[PDB]
Each structure stands twice: as structure tokens, then as C-alpha cells.
Design a protein around this ligand. Structure first.
Ligand SMILES: O=C(O)/C(O)=C/C(=O)c1cccc(O)c1
Ligand SMILES: [Mg+2]
Ligand code: NI
Length: 707
């Protein structure tokens, strides 16, 4: 591969050209001194990046030996963990000082959307998911069940449409109540002397809380829409008797529009497959078009115009406020190598290049696309403990100097998704006291790190049992406590994890309310549709109140956090073990095959119960680590795993279209071998991470497809 020499670095030409021709134009940064900054940061910061990675292994190996050397004594285990410096002293109370953050993060509680940056349409829809149609969300999914009468089909079904309408009217009643009567019986809306007036058949009523009236469009005496607010989220009733739905409605309502994905995370990490310069350029380019505003497949929303209750004009943001998730400290990428052929740390690159690109979002498009307060929002995943957070800080300060940006311009969304972070979370937050804009429980990764850390102690409970183990319940509460106690209320997001069941929206609406009821001012959804249905929860839960009631609680002990999810003796019949194995192998195989063969890093994979699951590297990190733990402790044999992989593989072949089967020549299929390796090599991956194998096998496939 052809490279450009800058100092000690050899930069892949496609990446060199991309920065110079596309990313640097318009930033007033001088290209020669940008690259000089790249060279200088790489050389100054690569050693400690590597030292931190060595500390991980050195710590895991001590813990390994300790478990090998009989009901686990917690007091001894605490003190060993403290002594090897795993468990560090909790610092004294403090308050974060992160300033210049936008209202969508400091103040608004609402859904947060994660989307793979390499898919421009997905990324486009996600940036546009700030507003979404409630009707579409209910008509298109199973929130409205398809009992007799209400089935979707080729044409519009009015029995279903009616239930959609009745559902939305009750949401209005429950969110923006009338002084008397129900939106179900409304026949019209007008604005009289700056106040909302709803016409019932007998009388007429106003709002039980007139402050919930935020504006309108059209003439005040028969507006084209009425705009409400509740818990800081906007609700827009679209009024159009002319339209098909509008004609049938007792008040001519066409839709209820919900402000939904308040912020969106454009993902470079677990939900994309990017193994060289060609791949990273594609991601960087899409991130560039998002920040310049001209990304198009279909284009980015402009803000929305309203008339205030008094008759003046105002505007509301039409776009999700955009985070970008960089990769973490682990991997390297040959998009840059040095003189010796050593690859450059990929995370360092993401900070330089996603940060460079982000500057366009602070500046007028073609009107400022992203942060009006002047911040750049970078999620930093998969950090292990407070020193690794301080490293990320040091990297962002050095990249700011290279880019010419005020110090602390680059904010950090801290993932709490590694065990050494969990049990040191307070010190991890303090380590970023003036950059941190959220903490979030990345429970999937956190579950993979739970299995790997304690890989030597014994067999683990089944995957489906993890969700209710004491360590994770402690971890979710301990994350809220640490957030609230560092002054996150009004300052930074307290965020929880992802709903993976992409077609079970009835279930999501019924159960995911637990997250705001637990004091989380945001949580993760995988589609704009799911963002819309998840907004409902924030209208029913007063997260501000919930957080206020939780201040000063400390609800998890370090003992509970350290409670390893060991399986109790002989808990499983032959058929239950088989199901776990089979299921784990199916999901692994389904995800890996599109990863290695097509470069898709996030796939909907049905499971053994045919539930469609949105899989990314974290869910793969759980399934691979679990089977490696069962294999390590004799729960299954190597014959079982190879048998199960061979069994599930044709099933995966069948579920797939411009695609290459894995059966029957398993030993020919790079995708099959990668899958096999994740399991049989699983205990030897650093912290169970799946990237090392996925990258090598993706690069392996790319080379084969080119000969
Ligand atoms: O729990 C975590 O560790 C975490 O980071 C979650 C994800 O990245 C994610 C994104 C899309 C789909 C999915 O299933 C998971
Ligand atoms: Mg994660
Ligand atoms: Ni309320």
C-alpha cells in the first residue's frame, strides 16, 4: 500500500488525500503543521497507550493465578484486588465543572440513538430522528397488536389506524391534560388571547397546565399545528382535515409528532467494521458530511419554525445533537504505520481525525449544524479505570493544541462498561471532571468483561441469567449514585443501555420505562422508530424529580459490585446446556459471517427462539466469552462446540443475499474459522475483546477476495 512520509509516519495515501482535500479545507488549520502535530502526538503518546494495555494483561494474569490458587471469600478477594492496585481509593466528594455544554445534554432527558457511521442513510435518518411520527411508530410495529381486525397489510387498515389514534389521544391525556375532558372527544383547536383552547362537544376547555402550551403554526384561530411541551420534550399535533387520516379524525388530526432522539451517537466502534484506511475514510467522510451539512443520499433537516403563544416567531432544533463514538485504547490500524512497520494506535487517530472533522459542525453549513455552545462530543468506550481516563484527557488536550481549539473543547462521554471502571467509577469521573458530559452503563461490554475477568474462577450462569445477577443490579445503581453525587443533575447525562430486540416494540414500551424510573436522563435505542416509542417513557417519568429523590443514596456496596456470577453446582440438564451452546453459536455465526464477508458490523440476527436481535461486537463479546468459560471448565467439550457450530452454520447460510455459504466446507470459510477462533481462543483474547480476531479475519478475507 502506497504511503506518504510525514516524520516517522507512513500515511496511507487514501487517508492522506482525504484529510488534505476534504477534511482540512475550511478549518484554517495549515496542513503541513497538522500532520506535524499528528506525528508529534503519536510519538509522545504511544508509549503510555501501550503501557496501559500491558497493565491490563498484567492485572488479569494476577487475578487468573489467584482464582487458580472454596466458596469465594470476599474479604480476601477485596484485599488482593486493592493490593495489586486494581481496586483504588475512592476520592473525596466533588462536582464536575464541564462547561459550554448544550441543553440537550445538560438538561433534557430523552432517548439517545446509536447508529453506525459507515451507513450514510442510517446516519442521515438518525440525525433527522430528533422529530418522529408517533402514528408511524404505532401503526408500523407491534405496540398496536394485530388481533382480529387490526392486522397490517398491503393497504391502509382503518381499524388499526383508529387504535393508533386512540392510543395517541390517551398519551395526550396522560402528558398534557385538559382542564376538563379528554383529547379523545376534542373537535378542534384554536389560540385565543395567547392560550390554547380545545373544543369539546358540550363545553370548551383549556390546559390543566397552560404552561404546557409552547406554540403553533398557521393562523391562531385554526392553526395547522399546536405545539406542546412536557418534561422538556415537545409534542406537536398536526392538524389537517384534508388528509386521509385527518378526514376520519374527530378533530382533523393528521399525526402526533414526538421530539424523540434528542442526541445521536455516530458510531466508529462496535457497530461498524473498519479494518484499514479505505474503511476509516468511508466513516470519516460520512462524519464530515454530517458536520458540513451536505451529507445526502434525502438530506439533513433544517430547524423548525413556530409561532409563540403571544404571536412572535421562534425556532426549535430540527436535528439530533451529534456525539461521535471513537474506538478505545486497544486496537491499532495500518492506515498509519511508522518506519518499522508498526501500526499506529487507532484511538489516537480517531481523536485527531474525528476531532478535526468536528470543527465543521461548530460553523455555518453549506447555519451552524451542531453545538451552538462550541463543544465537540466524543464517546470514549472500553476504558479500564481512572488512569486510562486521564490518558484520554491528555490525548484530547494534545489534539486540541494540534487543531487550534480552546482547551476542553473536546468533551468525553464516559462508557462504564469495564469492571475496573465500575469499581473505580468515582475516580474515573473525577479524572475527567472538566470534560465529562455523560456516564453510561454499557452493560453488554460490562457483561463480557465480567466473564473474562473471572474466567478462571468457574462456570458462569447462562447468558440469559446475567440480566438479574446481583453484580449487574449493583452496577446499574452504583453508576447512578456516582453520577448524581458528582453533580450530574443539570450538568451531564446519566445514561443506560441498549434495547436489542428490534421488532419487540410492545415489549420495549412496557419494560424499558425502568431506565428513567431508575434516574437515567437518557438511554440507548437502535432506530428512529424506537427513539419515538422510547420518548413516551420520558413523558410518563419525571426524571428530574426521580433524580432529586435519589440524591445522597449509596445503594450498592463494593461487595455487591464484586459478586462474581458463578453458576451453582450442577444447575443444568443436558438439554439446557445444549440450548445455550446452540444459541450462542448461532448468534456468533450470524454476526461474524456478515462482519468478515461483507464488512457489516451491526446485524439483525434471529436467535434460537427466532427473536430478532441487533448484534454488535459487545453481544459477540458475551457469547464468545461465555462458551470459552464453559469450555474452560468442562461444562462442554470441544466436540460439542464444533458440533454446534457445524449444526448452526447451515441455518445461518439459509437465513441469508449476494452472500457466500459457510457449509459444507467449513475449513474453507474464513467467516467460519473466525467464529471458531473467537470461542476456542476466547480465554486468550485481552479482556475477551473480539476486535483482534475480527480485524485479522476481515483483512484476510479482503486479501483473498483480491487474488
Ligand atoms: O452495551 C454496550 O457495551 C454498548 O456499547 C452497546 C452498543 O454499542 C450497541 C450498539 C448497537 C447495537 C447493540 O446491540 C449494541
Ligand atoms: Mg459497549
Ligand atoms: Ni410531570
Amino acid at each position: 500500500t502506497d504511503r506518504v512520509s510525514v516524520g516517522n509516519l507512513r500515511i496511507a495515501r487514501v487517508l492522506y488525500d482525504f484529510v488534505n482535500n476534504e477534511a482540512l479545507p475550511g478549518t484554517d488549520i495549515d496542513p503541513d503543521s497538522f500532520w506535524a502535530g499528528v506525528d508529534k502526538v503519536v510519538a509522545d503518546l504511544t508509549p503510555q497507550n501501550q503501557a496501559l494495555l500491558n497493565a491490563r494483561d498484567e492485572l488479569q494474569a494476577q487475578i487468573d493465578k489467584w482464582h487458580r490458587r472454596e466458596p469465594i471469600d470476599m474479604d480476601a478477594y477485596r484485599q488482593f484486588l486493592t493490593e495489586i492496585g486494581y481496586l483504588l481509593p475512592e476520592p473525596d466528594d466533588f462536582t464536575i465543572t464541564t462547561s459550554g455544554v448544550d441543553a440537550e445534554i445538560t438538561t433534557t432527558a430523552g432517548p439517545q440513538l446509536v447508529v453506525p457511521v459507515l451507513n450514510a442513510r442510517f446516519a442521515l435518518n438518525a440525525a433527522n430522528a430528533r422529530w418522529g411520527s408517533l402514528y408511524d411508530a404505532l401503526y408500523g410495529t407491534d405496540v398496536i397488536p394485530e388481533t382480529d381486525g387490526a392486522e397490517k397489510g398491503p393497504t391502509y387498515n382503518k381499524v388499526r389506524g383508529d387504535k393508533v389514534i386512540a392510543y395517541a389521544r390517551k398519551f395526550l391525556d396522560d402528558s398534557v391534560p385538559l382542564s376538563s375532558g379528554s383529547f379523545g372527544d376534542a373537535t378542534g383547536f384554536t389560540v385565543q388571547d395567547g392560550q390554547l383552547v380545545v373544543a369539546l362537544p358540550d363545553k370548551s376547555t383549556g390546559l390543566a397546565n397552560p404552561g404546557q402550551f409552547a406554540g403553533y403554526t398557521g393562523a391562531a384561530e385554526s392553526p395547522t399545528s399546536v405545539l406542546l411541551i412536557n418534561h422538556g420534550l415537545h409534542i406537536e399535533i398536526l392538524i389537517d382535515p384534508e388528509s386521509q387520516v385527518g378526514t376520519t379524525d374527530r378533530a382533523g388530526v393528521k399525526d402526533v409528532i414526538l421530539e424523540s432522539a434528542i442526541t445521536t451517537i455516530m458510531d466508529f466502534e462496535d457497530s461498524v467494521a473498519a479494518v484499514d484506511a479505505a474503511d476509516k475514510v468511508l466513516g470519516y467522510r460520512n462524519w464530515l458530511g454530517l458536520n458540513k451539512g451536505d451529507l445526502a443520499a434525502r438530506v439533513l433537516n433544517r430547524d423548525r419554525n413556530y409561532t409563540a403563544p403571544g404571536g412572535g416567531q421562534f425556532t426549535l432544533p430540527g436535528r439530533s445533537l451529534m456525539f461521535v463514538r471513537n474506538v478505545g485504547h486497544l486496537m491499532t490500524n495500518d492506515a498509519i504505520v511508522d518506519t518499522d512497520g508498526s501500526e499506529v494506535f487507532e484511538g489516537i487517530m480517531d481523536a485527531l481525525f474525528t476531532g478535526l472533522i468536528a470543527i465543521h459542525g461548530l460553523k455555518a453549513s453549506d447555519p451552524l449544524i451542531n453545538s451552538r455552545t462550541g463543544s465537540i462530543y466524543i464517546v470514549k468506550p472500553k476504558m479500564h479505570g481512572p488512569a486510562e481516563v486521564a490518558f484520554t484527557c491528555e490525548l484530547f488536550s494534545r489534539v486540541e493544541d494540534v487543531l487550534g481549539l480552546p482547551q476542553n473543547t473536546m468533551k468525553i462521554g464516559i462508557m462504564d462498561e469495564e469492571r475496573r471502571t465500575t469499581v473505580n467509577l468515582k475516580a474515573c469521573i473525577k479524572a475527567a471532571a472538566d470534560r465529562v458530559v455523560f456516564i453510561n452503563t454499557g452493560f453488554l461490554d460490562r457483561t463480557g468483561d465480567e466473564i473474562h475477568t473471572s474466567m478462571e474462577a468457574g462456570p458462569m450462569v447462562r447468558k440469559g441469567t446475567m440480566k438479574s445477577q446481583p453484580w449487574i443490579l449493583a452496577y446499574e445503581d452504583h453508576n447512578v449514585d456516582a453520577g448524581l453525587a458528582a453533580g450530574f443533575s443539570g450538568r451531564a447525562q446519566v445514561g443506560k443501555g441498549m434495547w436489542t430486540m428490534t421488532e419487540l416494540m410492545a415489549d420495549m414500551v412496557e419494560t424499558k420505562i425502568a431506565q428513567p424510573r431508575a434516574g437515567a436522563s437518557t438511554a440507548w435505542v437502535p432506530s428512529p422508530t424506537a427513539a419515538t416509542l422510547h420518548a413516551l417513557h420520558y413523558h410518563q417519568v419525571d426524571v428530574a424529580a426521580v433524580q432529586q429523590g435519589l440524591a445522597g443514596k449509596r445503594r450498592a456496596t463494593i461487595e455487591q459490585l464484586l459478586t462474581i456470577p458463578l453458576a451453582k453446582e450442577l444447575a443444568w440438564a443436558p438439554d439446557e446446556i445444549r440450548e445455550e451452546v446452540d444459541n450462542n453459536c448461532q448468534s456468533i455465526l450470524g454476526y461474524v459471517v456478515r462482519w468478515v464477508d461483507q464488512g457489516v458490523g451491526a446485524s439483525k440476527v434471529p436467535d434460537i427462539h427466532d427473536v430478532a436481535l441487533m448484534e454488535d461486537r459487545a453481544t459477540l463479546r458475551i457469547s464468545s466469552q461465555l462458551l470459552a468459560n464453559w469450555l474452560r471448565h468442562g461444562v462442554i467439550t470441544s466436540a460439542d462446540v464444533r458440533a454446534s457450530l457445524e449444526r448452526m452454520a447451515p441455518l445461518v447460510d439459509r437465513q441469508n443475499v449476494a452472500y457466500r455459504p459457510m457449509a459444507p466446507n467449513f475449513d474453507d470459510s474464513i467467516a467460519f474459522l473466525a467464529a471458531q477462533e473467537l470461542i476456542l481462543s476466547g480465554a486468550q483474547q485481552p479482556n475477551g475483546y473480539t476486535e483482534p480476531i475480527l480485524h485479522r479475519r476481515r483483512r484476510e478475507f479482503k486479501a483473498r477476495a483480491a487474488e
